[model samples]
Target chain A: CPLMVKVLDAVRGSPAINVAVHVFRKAADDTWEPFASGKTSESGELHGLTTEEEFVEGIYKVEIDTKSYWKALGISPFHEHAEVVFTANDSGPRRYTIAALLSPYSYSTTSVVTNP
Target chain B: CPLMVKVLDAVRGSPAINVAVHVFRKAADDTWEPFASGKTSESGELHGLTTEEEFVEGIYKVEIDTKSYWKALGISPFHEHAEVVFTANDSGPRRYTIAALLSPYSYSTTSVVTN
Candidate 1:
């Protein structure tokens, strides 16, 4: 049971930061159940968060709250929300890390596997 | 003189709301210069804002600050940033709207034509 994911910015050599995390368990109605939540650590990463043991190997979404967070810093961002939709298998304990980069204008996120 | 942009979520009828607005002017290095900024109003919209008049037809990106905002409300979201890339024609005024929707877990955004 090895599933890991990471997030990164679109541009290389760009400074990135941690945002937030939302985990959802697969529901009966083809929707998802809310599972766990956490913010990025000081290192711009959200790690060691827990999730449901019975997710039904389906589609799930993770959304980042961009508007209010950047607004608080007085940094005007071009986007208000960032999200990633992915599928998971029930056979293993999956892991994921989503990374993002912040500029006065835009940012990006990507998921990668770090451990097997 | 009709350049307007709107942002919305990808999910339909999902009870969407306003996020933020970023306007940039194209620069010489194929990069964009940050021009103006504003958050969405309570009505879930950003409108009547001013932009640079010397912008050329080029590509630009807009980003949202999702992590901090959701944290303030204790709402855990799936995405940390949302963005839109677009090109403008210096010949005429353009208008676009980007809207977004928030659920307990996920969200979406889209651009629409509006007056």
Candidate 2:
């Protein structure tokens, strides 16, 4: 897996399971193009959103369906979605792991990038 | 103020001191209006960002100066800036503390609201 995401429920103090994830890359036209999509597993992690060969240099956006995730748990959330955008492959091809802590009204995300 | 922000450096595993934080509220015209601005202290916190009276029911955006923080430390960063936007005072006026974990290439933010 070249890119991964881990989500945790702050209220539940556990993994945020089965959350939908959509990824996009900005094209030369400056429009975002869908690159990959997945849902977090029972363990609250999604791996292999894109292959190393397919994940090239560019700005990438990781949009987490935070609203639906909270709604599934019977709670109303703040943001409709939580997005993490960054440039990749510019510094070289590094594996990225996005870790997010989510609450009904707030969420936080951090990244861990390492050499493959 | 009713709002606060705490920033930490994930790479250094410590408080991210002297980071600039700007705040804005969505106006009726759907445009952003600057509400407050401050810099993180030595403890990586900016308290008193907004007063309870000033923070009314509306959507708010907390924009952190991430690029400068990393650049000051002599490292290149990824995101041009990091922003956390959410609806505030809708449910009720509560205190908001935005805690963010920042790295050169990535950052994460979580909010803790209390009565």
Candidate 3:
């Protein structure tokens, strides 16, 4: 199974294009090691971040660097980073999707597992 | 300046009373060490989580254990933890406040530095 992430600008009601997204997988040593990194596309989507890696049931984190994105728009975010941590498992479906809504002041995320 | 955190149930448009909240201060080794832990009050607020400790400008995290709270209400949350990471500084006002809105499926947070 592969993991997918979609980023959006909730205030603008549109995709959060060109935002830098970083993914980390928790290791047995209780440390989060960087697994993959990429930027959102025109549709504010990033797929196959874990496609090349083996999918294991564990804790994972997706960090969105919204500071640069908001600064470019002349907005100052209270927090520079938006981090979303969740548990990934191989229960219902082979693919999982986590969607994040971001604004300069706040963020929200939701996830679902579906058949690929 | 002291650090304060408020928790709320966004779905119900009310304070997240009795929810367990944990605070962590990032160490020099890039590890998050637990600094304090408490539950939201009747007003869904936890003040002075970092009152006693020397307030240093660094990265900190506030984790809300929402799984148990939602479960008590017969709701299942997709994630067990809602973690908010932010940087604290000794500028402007001496007091800072970070508020979090939580639901079974989503969460949001905002912060401000006030005098």
Q: How do the residues B1-115 of candidate 2 rate in per-residue lDDT, one tens digit apiece?
A: 5788999998888999999999989889988789999999999999988877778888888889898899999998877567887778546657888888887766777788888
- Candidate achieving higher lDDT, 1 or 2: 2
Compared with the true structure, what per-residue lDDT tens digits does model 3 show for residues A12-46?
Answer: 89999998989898999988989888888999998
C-alpha TM-scores of all predictions: 0.43, 0.73, 0.86
Worst 10 residues of 1 chain B by lDDT: B7-16
What residue pairs clash in candidate 3, if any at all? B1-B94
Q: Order candidates by lDDT, high to low.
A: 2, 3, 1
Lowest lDDT 10-residue stretch of candidate 2 chain B: B85-94
lDDT by residue for model 1 (A1-116), tens: 22223334333443235456676655678666786666765555565555435434565666565555566667655554554655554345455555544443444444543334
TM-score of chain A of each: 0.66, 0.97, 0.87
**What is the iRMS for every candidate structure?**
8.5, 2.4, 1.8
DockQ of each: 0.07, 0.38, 0.62
lDDT of 3 by residue, B1-115 (tens): 3877888997888999898988888999888898888898999998767663577788888888888888888987767678787777666646778888887877877776767
Better of 2 and 3 by lDDT: 2
**CAPRI classification of candidate 2:** acceptable
lDDT of each: 0.51, 0.86, 0.80
Q: Which is superior by DockQ, 1 or 3?
A: 3
Candidate that scores best on DockQ = 3
